[PDB]
Amino acid sequence: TNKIEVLNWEAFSKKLKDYSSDQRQFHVLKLGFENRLGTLSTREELEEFGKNNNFLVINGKVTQNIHDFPHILVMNKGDVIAHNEEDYHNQMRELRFSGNGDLHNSMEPKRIHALFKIELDSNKRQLLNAAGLGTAENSLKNINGMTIYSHGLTVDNKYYEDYSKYTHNSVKNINVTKERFIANDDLIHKLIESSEAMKQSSERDKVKAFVQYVANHTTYDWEAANKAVQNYADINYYLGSDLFAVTERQKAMCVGFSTTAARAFNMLGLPAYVVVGKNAEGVPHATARVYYDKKWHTIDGTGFITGNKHQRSAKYSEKHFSTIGEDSYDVVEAGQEPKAERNYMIIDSNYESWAMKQKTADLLLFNKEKSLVGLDYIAYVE
Amino acid sequence: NKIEVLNWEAFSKKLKDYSSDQRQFHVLKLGFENRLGTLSTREELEEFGKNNNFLVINGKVTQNIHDFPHILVMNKGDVIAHNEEDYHNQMRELRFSGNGDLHNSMEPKRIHALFKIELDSNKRQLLNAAGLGTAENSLKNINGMTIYSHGLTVDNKYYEDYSKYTHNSVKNINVTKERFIANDDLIHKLIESSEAMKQSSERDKVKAFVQYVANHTTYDWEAANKAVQNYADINYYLGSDLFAVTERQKAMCVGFSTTAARAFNMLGLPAYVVVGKNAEGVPHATARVYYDKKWHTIDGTGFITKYSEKHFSTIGEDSYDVVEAGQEPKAERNYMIIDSNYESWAMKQKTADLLLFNKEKSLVGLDYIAYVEPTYIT
Numbered sequence: 109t110n111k112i113e114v115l116n117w118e119a120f121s122k123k124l125k126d127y128s129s130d131q132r133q134f135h136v137l138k139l140g141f142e143n144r145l146g147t148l149s150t151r152e153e154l155e156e157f158g159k160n161n162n163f164l165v166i167n168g169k170v171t172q173n174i175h176d177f178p179h180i181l182v183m184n185k186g187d188v189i190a191h192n193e194e195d196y197h198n199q200m201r202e203l204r205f206s207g208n209g210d211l212h213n214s215m216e217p218k219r220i221h222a223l224f225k226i227e228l229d230s231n232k233r234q235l236l237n238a239a240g241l242g243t244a245e246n247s248l249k250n251i252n253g254m255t256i257y258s259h260g261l262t263v264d265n266k267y268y269e270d271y272s273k274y275t276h277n278s279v280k281n282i283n284v285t286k287e288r289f290i291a292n293d294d295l296i297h298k299l300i301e302s303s304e305a306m307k308q309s310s311e312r313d314k315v316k317a318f319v320q321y322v323a324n325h326t327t328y329d330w331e332a333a334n335k336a337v338q339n340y341a342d343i344n345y346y347l348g349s350d351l352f353a354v355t356e357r358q359k360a361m362c363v364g365f366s367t368t369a370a371r372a373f374n375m376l377g378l379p380a381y382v383v384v385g386k387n388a389e390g391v392p393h394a395t396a397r398v399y400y401d402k403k404w405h406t407i408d409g410t411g412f413i414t415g416n417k418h419q420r421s422a423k424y425s426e427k428h429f430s431t432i433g434e435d436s437y438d439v440v441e442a443g444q445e446p447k448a449e450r451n452y453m454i455i456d457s458n459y460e461s462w463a464m465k466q467k468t469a470d471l472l473l474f475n476k477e478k479s480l481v482g483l484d485y486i487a488y489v490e
Numbered sequence: 491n492k493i494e495v496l497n498w499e500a501f502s503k504k505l506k507d508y509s510s511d512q513r514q515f516h517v518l519k520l521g522f523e524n525r526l527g528t529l530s531t532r533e534e535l536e537e538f539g540k541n542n543n544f545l546v547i548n549g550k551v552t553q554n555i556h557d558f559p560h561i562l563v564m565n566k567g568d569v570i571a572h573n574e575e576d577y578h579n580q581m582r583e584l585r586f587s588g589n590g591d592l593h594n595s596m597e598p599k600r601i602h603a604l605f606k607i608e609l610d611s612n613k614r615q616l617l618n619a620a621g622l623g624t625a626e627n628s629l630k631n632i633n634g635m636t637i638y639s640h641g642l643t644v645d646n647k648y649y650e651d652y653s654k655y656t657h658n659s660v661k662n663i664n665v666t667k668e669r670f671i672a673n674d675d676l677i678h679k680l681i682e683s684s685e686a687m688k689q690s691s692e693r694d695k696v697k698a699f700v701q702y703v704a705n706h707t708t709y710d711w712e713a714a715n716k717a718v719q720n721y722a723d724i725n726y727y728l729g730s731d732l733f734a735v736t737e738r739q740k741a742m743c744v745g746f747s748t749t750a751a752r753a754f755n756m757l758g759l760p761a762y763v764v765v766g767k768n769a770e771g772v773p774h775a776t777a778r779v780y781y782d783k784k785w786h787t788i789d790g791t792g793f794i795t796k797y798s799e800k801h802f803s804t805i806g807e808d809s810y811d812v813v814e815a816g817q818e819p820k821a822e823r824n825y826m827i828i829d830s831n832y833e834s835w836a837m838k839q840k841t842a843d844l845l846l847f848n849k850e851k852s853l854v855g856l857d858y859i860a861y862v863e864p865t866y867i868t
Contacts, residue, residue, distance in 0.1 A: 232846070
């Protein structure tokens with residue numbers, strides 16, 4: 109009866125070149141999945157599918173003619189094809205748990221397939237659910253002259269997919285490569301360009317311009333900030349706070365804003381670092397400290413959060429006009445305990461005295477070339 | 491001073507040579523202030539050898555630190571500076587975590603030395619100003635000689651925070667049959683402790699178990715509150731899966747219901763897990779459980795930040811309207827979506843078969859059928 113060969117991309121590609129040399133695009137079906145894995149796929153994209161899938165040849169045929177278009181059949185590398193009924197029933201005798209798979213590297217749900225009808229019925233799936241487990245759903249594909257049936261082989265925690273989204277989000281921003289970091293520095297450079305900060309005369313107006321631009325093109329993450337004030341554990345806090353938040357994600361919280369700003373200011377020859385303290389409403393906050401016009405300043409790049417105002421005291425007036433809230437924080441020295449509990453930033457004066465005297469490009473530590481003021485400029489004078 | 495770095499094989503050779511009598515070691519890992527192992531065996535040392543190499547200092551394989559033998563290890567990948575210049579070369583250009591081959595692992599690497607090396611506060615302030623971090627300065631004084639360590643690779647400064655999410659996301663999936671069986675054992679302990687088997691009637695077994703579990707498991711009100719705030723949260727899954735009440739000892743409705751359903755099938759009380767809305771109109775889950783000739787809705791969700799007998803009677807048992815799979819609820823309040831055809835099928839099964847796996851952990855053996863209820867008066 110019907111034969112099925114399982115080949116990898118190398119072997120399959122050979123057969124493809126023999127039986128379909130003129131064919132340039134292919135649809136691709138993956139056994140166990142509703143939608144095409146690929147539509148109008150090229151041989152390069154086929155090869156890419158070959159990393160996680162093997163290819164099927166059925167009765168000598170490399171493709172299935174479906175609505176007059178060649179379809180390639182693939183399946184997950186750990187899947188099994190039951191040869192006959194006896195084999196299938198051997199295979200389903202005992203629940204097969206995901207963690208006991210031989211190949212350690214791939215423990216996503218495996219499937220079993222057969223040219224005869226196989227399924228796991230709603231009763232068995234209800235019992236799996238009753239043990240907190242899940243397993244891939246029933247499905248089939250009608251092809252040329254036969255039908256291939258599929259369903260879960262391994263059982264696992266029924267929340268596997270939900271969890272695995274957290275796996276992905278938890279790793280996509282760590283193990284950062286030098287390439288990733290340089291590309292981010294490019295994103296910052298582009299923010300600097302778009303802000304037109306370099307077109308400003310004074311250093312102060314450079315700051316103003318960049319801060320206002322970023323505030324006008326980055327979403328503040330109200331939800332995550334909300335959950336963070338009620339110290340509720342949230343991966344979104346980190347996604348809004350790290351070096352990729354305003355640049356890649358375009359959605360950020362205070363630490364994100366302040367880190368992107370500090371990086372940008374150092375590029376612009378304006379000695380900067382990130383500080384933390386508390387809101388004028390007592391809630392934990394973060395800002396940048398930036399050196400310009402002979403002084404270290406507190407710059408709050410997220411000055412739109414608090415609906416409630418608080419004036420006073422006079423140093424020396426509101427007439428010292430700022431439209432980015434320059435130096436509106438009290439400062440607390442690193443080490444010293446905060447004597448108040450609102451409207452302070454914890455600064456480090458030794459570091460500030462040190463930083464203002466360094467070559468600004470050195471302050472970048474790495475990728476020093478992206479400095480916009482060369483490699484020798486020092487902000488401090490006399 | 492001489493420091494030599496050995497994998498577990500070679501080090502085991504030398505340990506056999508010089509410390510055969512010692513069957514337990516404490517284990518210090520360079521760059522870490524706590525011990526890595528406490529009274530570790532050679533088994534556990536071998537496990538340590540998967541991600542760490544072993545230090546041999548001036549020929550010695552073991553150290554007397556507080557009148558007990560200690561072994562020094564360090565992460566594979568960590569580097570040793572031999573002199574000031576060598577140290578400068580290693581540090582000359584930022585080393586990013588993701589640029590190791592490695593092939594494994596990609597955890598922060600550290601650099602070590604027998605002379606003073608540190609990443610001072612200035613440098614860490616600049617790293618911080620880049621959104622970057624690296625391992626802390628650290629120190630071990632072994633026997634008059636001092637081993638200095640600090641971070642070597644740099645990465646996203648939230649590396650540790652993200653990695654807790656990585657860990658929590660994978661620790662409960664790729665479940666092994668051994669893990670599943672051990673979870674069944676945890677459930678058995680809950681049953682024993684609940685004294686449910688020592689009750690006379692089915693209803694009392696159900697009440698005892700549900701009560702005990704709801705009284706000895708933390709209800710995760712935060713996760714629940716955020717779930718009704720439709721704020722995506724890994725803690726929902728941690729409070730909902732099969733390890734929630736058993737391992738985590740902290741759960742929401744699906745967790746309580748799933749553990750209870752499993753226990754009831756073990757106890758010979760046909761059970762499955764159903765969803766719907768509680769009396770407030772918010773998404774809830776319960777267990778449907780067969781006993782006393784009827785299918786019942788059992789809501790065993792706890793309240794501890796006491797689940798009483800009154801609560802069981804008025805809320806825990808049969809307090810929901812049932813709606814058939816496929817049908818619309820009367821209001822969006824106080825209903826559970828059941829499968830009547832499934833209920834009819836399951837109640838006639840050998841209850842061990844309802845467990846699908848680890849059937850020998852059935853507390854009523856292999857032949858128990860709940861549907862056997864042959865007289866009217868009971």
